[PDB]
Design a binder for this molecule. Structure first.
Ligand code: NAG
Ligand code: NAG
Ligand code: NAG
Lengths: 50, 50
């Protein structure tokens, strides 16, 4: 004799696709710190692109 | 699709507010004073609400 036992198999597909502004997070929309941040490297593009 | 920049909306005027008092702080006479406290016993002066 046999049987059927349907079972659940759960698989993640998509973690919540987050996006973080490069300079809004780091600088609170100011004038001197924005220039100081751009004085750093191309991290605004790097992090946002990743 | 390309996220170019942020959208930080500029302010439209300025607002300043303060304690609604007109008292002055007794500073000038302290420097003018010939009478003066000691150093091994320096004086304290709780200036407030002015
Ligand atoms: C086999 O198992 C099922 C499960 O309940 C049952 O309904 C059926 O009668 C069984 N077959 C026999 C021949 O006993
Ligand atoms: C606060 O200041 C305003 C403007 O000087 C005045 O009209 C008002 O009466 C003041 N109120 C208090 C509680 O000091
Ligand atoms: C008293 O002190 C104030 C504040 O330091 C100064 O502006 C003023 O010139 C002083 N007065 C005299 C006579 O030195």
């Amino acid at each position: 004799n046999f049987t059927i036992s349907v079972t659940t198999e759960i698989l993640p597909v998509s973690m919540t696709k987050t996006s973080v502004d490069c300079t809004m997070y780091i600088c609170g929309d100011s004038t001197e710190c924005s220039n100081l941040l751009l004085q750093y490297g191309s991290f605004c593009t790097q992090l946002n692109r990743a | 699709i390309y996220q170019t920049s942020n959208f930080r909306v500029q302010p439209t005027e300025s607002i300043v507010r303060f304690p609604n008092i007109t008292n002055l702080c007794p500073f000038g006479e302290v420097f003018n004073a010939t009478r003066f406290a000691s150093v091994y016993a320096w004086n304290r002066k709780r200036i407030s609400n002015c």
